[PDB]
């Protein structure tokens, strides 16, 4: 029965119940249903008008908190002598909820999510005075042509949604829409992306938002700067389906749900909850 | 034009602010909403589902032996079988539950709990248990005469294989905190203990060491507020291939 | 978009500004309002309550002897017992009162005061006092013939053990200031003096040195404005364990 | 009253006399794809009796040292009967499932089965950063044994696995769990040979224990597809 629930439910008073046939404490877990034993039906209650709002447990309010999804300190200098592995004043980033575990465990509570990403790009700068650098954050789709240089002609943004912003400005906030080809983001994808057997397991590219190619629009300055670009994603307009067990073991990788666990309890493989002495030993005991 | 002035709090990025922001892809047509089964619109739907306690959170219980409690035939009268730390917000048997893992995204919680214990002995195994929720203030009761003064349920083993120990919301305060102090009046919940009402009595062909799977859900009274990040997960370094998401 | 321009006063943090600010915890459900007894919605409720004067603010009155005034049997006629500095805003007997400590959070004050004197002799102790509020301008009156020309009350000691010397609001200005100048026409209030109307007359088994507890409240005429920080409290260094609130 | 249950699908039928109930997963009964949710424009073949019937999988020996068993759907059924031939000949499928897990023992045995149907069970390998390959996931009709079922082989918790559609086979109380699964995918239809929506998971939370003569107690699984559609006809692949 679907009903609008704004506050937690009231408790009716109850009296002495001595009745054959009606055993409300006795329930069947084997049916899979959670026990419907009301607190009135189990113990003797008073009338309580419960005014506690349930609004902070809304899945919209649960997940619409702008959490960190990307962070790169990258050097901002002459890159004529640097190696061809570091960021030559730009970084591509396939937009990925899996990189940071606080938002990842929250989004992996559910199986399917339908949200709009409210990407806030916080750029901060340190010296190896601070410059007022202008940054471009060109939104490239999944697999499309990502730039090769800082001053390459992919940054002209004929159709890719670039956002130009400065360090001295407030952080650039754009709204990435619901960009899955399916009706929800498959947070877990039990299956393979490709038709051949070489495809990566669990990684649905429909779950992938796209690339976030971020460069610094200014040319290279005679001193080098370490520019750290933090990206904050706020899921919004959130519809969520099929909740899951929250992940207890520590994450190993962003590409999959591999597990190793801690060496000892808590959150270990053989023992998730921290150990105690016996089953009849109370750890936090009020001894006076 | 319009005479304005910047307030304190201008140009600051609060993470939990709720403001309309600039659309990156204009006139975007999102994928049409399909009826996917099992929509959660409120996290208290997830909390009210039963989920197994690790009452056997000891050593020498490796992995799955932590979810069940081995009870045996006893030669002594009215013996303690197990007691359960009731700190949802702290580490203990309630932590890795649906009522526990979601409430560790919060700080203040209210409402009544719901402990369900499914006996998993033989059909020939007959026994009776008492499940005493003691409201806090004193020590964990070790004798049954001490514990049955509190809120309890006496459970016969027959056709129905589960009781519900309703843990009533007995608190002075409207909610209860996390503090890292399990012995605080604002945080401590009480003690659920279990004693042999009579005994676990099996015949010669049943196993003498039967089991108990302990569930906990929350009720419709339940409530959560003051959202925080979970202490159940951590991150020491970058995850593997997270540098390869930039390459 | 909307053509705006920043006024002078943009981006400045005034402490006493009243603007809606960004909620840190969105869709927060505060604890429901319970009827707690004794709600103060206006600080003039606190001010209109009587509270003891330290009329005996001398040396050799250590601690609690400062709250009472020892009056004795006298062999001379019409003697001065005590006089009270009426500067609420300055240091004096009215300072550590409810009318005094709250008004030292303000600068401009108006309205009538209310001095109540509770005699604490024996039941056999009979006496009469005059309580002369002299409006300011001249010296504090030292003889009773000088003081009874002002506003006074003559008080017999019987069943009822207290009078009210209403200090009427006699001022040219609508309010009265603090200035650190107690002798200013904008700040000075006057002088309450007390004289033996007849005498304090006790029998041979009562104590010869009876007491007077002097109260002051304010009336419904009273008013306060121009809020300031209190000079009654100071802070030279950080308080102890204030560094431990950061650890 | 609810202990007896006959499930008539197609020519197949299953009675059970110690049943708990049957779990209509997330309160949702399977149906065909409606026109407002439909995507593939060609007319889907709906055989309605050649596939909508109980395909009984191979039984697995419920033992003392057993960790668990899992069957990924429809990977368990992509080579069985007319569901398998419709899978191999079509690009798309949309089918709910009616899992009926059979496991009985005497009234002297004890044990508990968490018969839980996990939607989108992205497995994880243990103590490595390499993702599970094709052979580690797509076991087919045989199914797979859990390696660490206490964490459900994906770092999550078995203790919270009752958030999924689940029933219990407590050998004390019942002997058959029945979970009626709808179409659980973000897409309306999908390619069956490279994706599995539901994963039936069967876990020994209480192991098989008795003191009598140790007869073999197996766990038989009878998964019936429900409300099958199949678009995109072509040649078979297998």
């Amino acid at each position: 029965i679907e009903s609008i629930i704004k506050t937690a439910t009231d408790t009716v008073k109850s009296e002495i119940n001595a009745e054959l046939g009606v055993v409300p404490s006795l329930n069947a877990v084997e049916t899979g249903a959670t026990s419907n034993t009301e607190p009135e039906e189990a113990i003797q209650t008073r009338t309580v008008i419960n005014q506690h709002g349930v609004s902070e447990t809304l899945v919209e309010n649960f997940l619409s908190r702008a959490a960190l999804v990307s962070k790169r300190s990258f050097e901002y200098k002459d890159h004529t002598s640097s190696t061809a592995r570091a960021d030559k004043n730009f970084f591509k980033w396939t937009i990925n909820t899996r990189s940071f575990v606080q938002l990842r465990r929250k989004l992996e509570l559910f199986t399917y999510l339908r949200f709009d990403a409210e990407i806030t790009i916080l750029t901060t700068v340190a010296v190896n005075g601070l410059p007022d650098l202008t940054l471009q954050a060109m939104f490239v789709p999944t697999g499309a042509l990502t730039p090769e240089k800082q001053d390459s002609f992919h940054w002209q943004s004929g159709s890719n949604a670039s956002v130009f912003f400065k360090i001295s400005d407030p952080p650039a906030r754009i709204t990435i829409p619901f960009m899955c080809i399916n009706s929800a983001y498959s947070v877990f994808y039990d299956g393979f992306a490709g038709f051949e057997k070489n495809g990566l397991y669990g990684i649905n590219p429909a779950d992938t938002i796209g690339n976030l190619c971020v460069r610094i629009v200014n040319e290279h300055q005679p001193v080098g700067f370490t520019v750290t670009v933090r990206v904050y994603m706020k899921p919004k307009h959130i519809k969520a389906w099929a909740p899951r067990p929250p992940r207890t073991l520590p994450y190993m990788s962003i590409a999959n749900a591999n597990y190793k666990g801690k060496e000892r309890a808590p959150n270990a493989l053989s023992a998730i909850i921290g150990n105690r002495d016996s089953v009849k030993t109370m750890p936090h005991n009020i001894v006076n | 034009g319009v005479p304005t002035y910047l307030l304190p709090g201008s140009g600051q990025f609060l993470t939990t602010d709720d403001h309309s922001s600039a659309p990156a892809l204009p006139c975007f047509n999102p994928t049409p909403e399909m009826h996917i089964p099992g929509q959660v619109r409120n996290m208290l739907e997830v909390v009210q589902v039963e989920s197994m306690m690790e009452i056997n959170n000891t050593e020498s219980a490796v992995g799955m032996e932590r979810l069940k409690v081995d009870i045996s035939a006893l030669t002594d009268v009215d013996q303690l079988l197990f007691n359960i730390p009731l700190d949802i917000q702290l580490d203990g048997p309630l932590r890795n539950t649906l009522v526990g893992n979601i409430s560790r995204y919060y700080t203040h919680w209210s409402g009544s709990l719901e402990m369900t214990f499914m006996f998993c002995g033989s059909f020939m195994a007959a026994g009776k248990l008492i499940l005493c929720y003691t409201p806090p203030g004193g020590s964990c009761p070790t004798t049954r005469e001490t514990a049955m003064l509190g809120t309890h349920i006496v459970w016969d083993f027959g056709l129905q294989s589960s009781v519900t120990l309703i843990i009533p919301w007995i608190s002075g305060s409207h909610y209860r905190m996390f503090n890292n102090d399990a012995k605080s009046t604002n945080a401590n919940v009480g003690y659920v203990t279990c004693f042999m009402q009579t005994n676990l009595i099996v015949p010669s062909e049943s196993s003498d060491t039967c089991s108990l799977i302990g569930f906990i859900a929350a009720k419709d009274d339940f409530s959560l507020r003051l959202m925080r990040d979970s202490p159940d997960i951590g991150q020491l370094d970058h995850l593997h291939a997270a540098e390869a998401a930039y390459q | 978009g909307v053509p705006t321009y920043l006024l002078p006063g943009s981006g400045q943090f005034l402490t006493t500004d009243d603007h809606s600010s960004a909620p840190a915890l969105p869709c927060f459900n505060p604890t429901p309002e319970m009827h707690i007894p004794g709600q103060v919605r206006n600080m003039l409720e606190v001010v209109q309550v009587e509270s003891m004067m330290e009329i005996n603010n001398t040396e050799s009155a250590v601690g609690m002897e400062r709250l009472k005034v020892d009056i004795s049997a006298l062999t001379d006629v019409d003697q001065l017992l005590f006089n009270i500095p009426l500067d609420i805003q300055l240091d004096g007997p009215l300072r550590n009162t409810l009318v005094g400590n709250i008004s030292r959070y303000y600068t401009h004050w108006s309205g009538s005061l209310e001095m109540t004197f509770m005699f604490c002799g024996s039941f056999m102790a009979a006496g009469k006092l005059i309580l002369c509020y002299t409006p300011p301008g001249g010296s504090c009156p030292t003889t009773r013939e000088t003081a009874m020309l002002g506003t006074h009350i003559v008080w017999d000691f019987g069943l009822q053990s207290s009078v009210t010397l209403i200090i009427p609001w006699i001022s040219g200005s609508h309010y009265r200031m603090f200035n650190n100048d107690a002798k200013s026409t904008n700040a000075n209030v006057g002088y309450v003096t007390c004289f033996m109307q007849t005498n304090l007359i006790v029998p041979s088994e009562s104590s010869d040195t009876c007491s007077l507890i002097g109260f002051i409240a304010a009336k419904d005429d009273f008013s306060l404005r121009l809020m300031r920080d209190s000079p009654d409290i100071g802070q030279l260094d950080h308080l102890h364990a204030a560094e431990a609130a950061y650890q | 009253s609810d202990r007896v249950l006959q499930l008539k699908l197609g020519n197949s039928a299953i009675v059970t006399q110690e049943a708990a109930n049957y779990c209509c997963a997330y309160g949702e009964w399977p149906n065909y794809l409606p026109d407002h949710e439909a995507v593939a424009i060609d007319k889907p073949t709906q055989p309605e009796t050649a596939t909508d019937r109980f395909y009984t999988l191979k039984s697995v020996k419920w033992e003392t040292g057993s960790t668990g068993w899992w069957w990924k759907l429809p990977d368990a059924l992509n080579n069985i009967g007319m569901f398998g031939q419709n899978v191999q000949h079509h690009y798309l499928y949309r089918s709910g499932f009616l899992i009926h897990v059979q496991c009985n023992a005497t009234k002297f045995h004890q044990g508990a089965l968490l018969v839980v149907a996990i939607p989108e069970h992205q497995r994880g390998a243990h103590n490595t950063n390499t993702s599970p390959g094709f052979d580690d996931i797509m076991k087919g009709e045989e199914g797979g044994t859990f390696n660490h079922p206490y964490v459900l082989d994906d770092g999550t918790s078995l203790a919270c696995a009752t958030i999924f559609p689940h029933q219990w086979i407590n050998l004390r109380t019942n002997n058959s769990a029945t979970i009626v699964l709808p179409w659980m995918n973000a897409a309306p239809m999908d390619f069956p040979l490279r994706h599995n929506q539901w994963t039936l998971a069967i876990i020994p939370v209480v192991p098989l224990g008795t003191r009598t003569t140790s007869s073999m107690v197996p766990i038989t699984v009878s998964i019936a597809p429900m409300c099958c559609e199949f678009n995109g006809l072509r040649h078979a692949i297998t």
């Binding site: 709009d116 | 600039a22 619109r41 739907e45 | 969105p26 | 997330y26």
Partner: peptide, 30 residues
């Protein structure tokens, strides 16, 4: 609340959907 954009996804978060149905989880049986 404000939403001066031309796209309905660009609005603020819809923190008003108080409709919940726990009985598809707590009582998923028929």
């Amino acid at each position: 609340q404000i939403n001066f954009y031309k796209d309905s996804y660009a609005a603020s978060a819809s923190k008003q959907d108080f409709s919940q149905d726990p009985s598809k989880f707590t009582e998923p049986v028929v």
